Amino acid sequence: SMEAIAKYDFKATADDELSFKRGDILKVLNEECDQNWYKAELNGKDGFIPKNYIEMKPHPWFFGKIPRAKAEEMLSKQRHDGAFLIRESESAPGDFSLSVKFGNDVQHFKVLRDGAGKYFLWVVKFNSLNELVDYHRSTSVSRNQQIFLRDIEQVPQQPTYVQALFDFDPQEDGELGFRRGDFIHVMDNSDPNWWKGACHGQTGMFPRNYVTPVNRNV
Amino acid sequence: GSMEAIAKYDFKATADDELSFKRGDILKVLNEECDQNWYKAELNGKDGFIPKNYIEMKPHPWFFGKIPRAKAEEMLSKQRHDGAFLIRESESAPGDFSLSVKFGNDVQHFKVLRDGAGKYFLWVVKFNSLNELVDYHRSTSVSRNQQIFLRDIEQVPQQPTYVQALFDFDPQEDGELGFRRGDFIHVMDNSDPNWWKGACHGQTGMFPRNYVTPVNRNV
Amino acid sequence: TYSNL
């Protein structure tokens, strides 16, 4: 099982299919009832979806080395209060900041990191940035008003690829076959050992240690 | 250890032991990192120190994913030199690849075919991989009307790629990168299967790929 | 800026 992001709006064509909108996050189930379809669930509804309408899920809120200016840019456009992201300073490497939208402005918090490697905003110290974010999904980040962090509306990205290091003939069913050198579209890398991908018109599981990254360029 | 990286910015050397370079240059970076904030590097027969925070992981030079036919044309027609190219995978036929090449003021697209044995080919010559296909056609023309040879496009620095630590890592040697479970690590070199080069908490060094999981692109 | 100086 896996989550993916919708690249297009899909209106269901029969009653056993699942409608969705671009950018929705879909829970896809391991199986594929058709060669071109998955069964999937979304917002309390279940049905089939087409393989070629979904993309690997982007990270929901870690946004790398983007500047404070650009973060205000993308958070201004979000419809919902609490929309947030975390960014590294390209100035001070390794230091992080938290940008959140509330009303017609954008607040910036500095994430602190103590002698033990613990992160914090105020007093409570967290083992990781994930623990900070999830804490503040239900306790406000602001000391004046209730700001609860909410994932921004997500947009599907350009696809991520790997490249085969070795030939891989599939033994088991539902495994993806390829040849050394082949470029593989990656659909799910959430698991440390077995990833879901596509090549030569097929989809399936393959072992990550048979492939090497293809670094982004567009 | 040793790695190629791409310059994010122009850099004029500030001392005679430093190396000047321009944005988009591919630098060879040495395993002998000789200062906290500086790598030793080579570029076109020159060498010197370069600032760590001026360089990015090298992007793939010619495989461009499912870039549409129109965007490929726009990207290529702006290139300065003929034979500039990329490979792309079709958006409507998954698994099928096309080679797009700049022919003067036109862009031309060639459908790469795959036989029953996994060999790729355009006309007569068969290849074991798109890499072999590309390398053949760097020195043999990709057309029989005229003499066109494949040339990498103008390389451009991209937004950084990150991984995330699955476990704590405690370095034993100086050139290794320490981190805690959950830390986001800026990836500088991922071309070796077992040991990757990265940055976090203001340090750079090597770490085992086994300790980390991908952070998927979003910007 | 920063909301926690």
Residue numbers in the entry:
A (entry chain B): 0 to 217
B (entry chain A): -1 to 217
C (entry chain C): 23 to 27
Q: What do the authors report?
A:
PEAK pseudokinases regulate cell migration, invasion and proliferation by recruiting key signaling proteins to the cytoskeleton. PEAK proteins are a unique group of pseudokinase (PsK) scaffolds that can self-assemble regulatory networks.
The first was a tyrosine/SH2 motif (YSNL; PEAK3Y24/PEAK1Y1107) that is highly conserved in PEAK3 and PEAK1 vertebrate orthologs (and absent in PEAK2 vertebrate orthologs) that matches the known phosphotyrosine consensus motif for the Grb2 SH2 domain (Grb2SH2; consensus motif: pYxNx) and the CrkII SH2 domain (CrkIISH2; consensus motif: pYxx(P/L), proline typically preferred). We confirm that active Src, but not Abl, phosphorylates the conserved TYSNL SH2-motif (PEAK3Y24, PEAK1Y1107), supporting previous cellular studies, and thereby provides a binding site on either PEAK3 or PEAK1 for Grb2SH2 or possibly CrkIISH2. To do this we utilized a synthetic 7-mer pY phospho-peptide encompassing this SH2 motif (TpYSNLGQ; corresponding to PEAK323–29-pY24 and PEAK11106–1112-pY1107), hereafter “SH2-pY peptide”. We have previously shown by isothermal titration calorimetry (ITC) that this SH2-pY peptide binds to both full length Grb2 (Grb2FL, KD 2.6 µM) and CrkII (CrkIIFL, KD 7.8 µM). Using an approach developed for apo-Grb2FL 36, we succeeded in crystallizing a complex of human Grb2FL:PEAK SH2-pY peptide and solved an X-ray structure to a resolution of 2.7 Å. Whilst no density was apparent for the C-terminal (-GQ) residues of the peptide, we noticed a potential surface groove directly adjacent on Grb2SH2.
